[PDB]
Design a protein around this ligand. Structure first.
Ligand SMILES: O=C(O)C(=O)Nc1sc2c(c1C(=O)O)CCNC2
Ligand SMILES: [Cl-]
Ligand SMILES: [Cl-]
Length: 285
């Protein structure tokens, strides 16, 4: 609760001085810079959505195949918070099989999608999941079948139940798809409240629990909206875990996160929203 007070005070000071842009640029300046050799290999060029968004070598997810283990995905491991997330780009038409291979191999229970397939007339992500029950998808390169089991469309987000089957073994797994449909690219959710309800729904599902593989989180690039979501979740969690006397430094936590994947949170206003969500979330809880 001491942490709640200090964070509100910090928020108000930043807000009054109009320092969000400067503080965000400071974070960009001091963010970790690690090699992305595998990502930059010529043969992986068509596996990357954006030339300026790559996974670091040290934290990238490796596909368990022998010919090419590369996917644009990173493991964010928050030690104190005991949270792990896989942040990845919105799959390309040729990497949908890879995406679901990763989900299978990493034993993820949930996938958090923070974008729409089409945004402002532009394709931002492949249609990597089935839209009708009787029309399943088969990914021949990775030998997986994907079936839409059910779908619940709400005003701010959609929750789906998917069934992923390893065709090689005929083993099946239930995957939860949490699709936030009202979060504009390079923007913020319509309110802290609707963001928090979404986050709480993801939390309640067990998808973030140590008993499962890490949740898969993605937007178009897997850094802007994806970064905002994970930062808020982790910081909210730390607000609860840490006893007085304590504080939660959102800037430090974000820098910690950026050790695992570049460019997490893409605008100063997304950073500001992160503060708001954590502050409001903590008050509610
Ligand atoms: O989807 C997000 O929230 C996100 O970070 N998107 C990003 S990050 C990023 C781009 C995009 C994009 O969507 O066009 C394009 C240029 N490079 C950086
Ligand atoms: Cl969509
Ligand atoms: Cl950046």
């Amino acid at each position: 609760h001491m942490a709640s007070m200090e964070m509100e005070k910090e928020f108000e000071q930043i807000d009054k001085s109009g320092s969000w842009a400067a503080i965000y640029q400071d974070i960009r300046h001091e963010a970790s810079d690690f090699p992305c050799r595998v990502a930059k290999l010529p043969k992986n060029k068509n596996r990357n959505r954006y030339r300026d968004v790559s996974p670091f070598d040290h934290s990238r997810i490796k596909l368990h195949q022998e010919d090419n283990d590369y996917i644009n995905a990173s493991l964010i491991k928050m030690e104190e918070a005991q949270r792990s997330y896989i942040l990845t780009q919105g799959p390309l038409p040729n990497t949908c099989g890879h995406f679901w291979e990763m989900v299978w191999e990493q034993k993820s229970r949930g996938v958090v999608m923070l974008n729409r397939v089409m945004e402002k007339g532009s394709l931002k992500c492949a249609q990597y999941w089935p839209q009708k029950e009787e029309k399943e998808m088969i990914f021949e390169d990775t030998n997986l079948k994907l079936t839409l089991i059910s779908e619940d469309i709400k005003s701010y987000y959609t929750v789906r139940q998917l069934e992923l089957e390893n065709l090689t073994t005929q083993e099946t797994r239930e995957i939860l798809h949490f699709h936030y449909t009202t979060w504009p690219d390079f923007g913020v959710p319509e309110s802290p409240a609707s963001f928090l309800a979404f986050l709480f729904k993801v939390r309640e599902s067990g998808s973030l629990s140590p008993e499962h593989g890490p949740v898969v989180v993605h937007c178009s690039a897997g850094i802007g909206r994806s970064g905002t979501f994970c930062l808020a979740d982790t910081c909210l969690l730390l607000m609860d875990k840490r006893k007085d006397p304590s504080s939660v430094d959102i800037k430090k936590v974000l820098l910690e996160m950026r050790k695992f994947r570049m460019g997490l949170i893409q605008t100063a206003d997304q950073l500001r929203f992160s503060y708001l969500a954590v502050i409001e979330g903590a008050k509610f809880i």
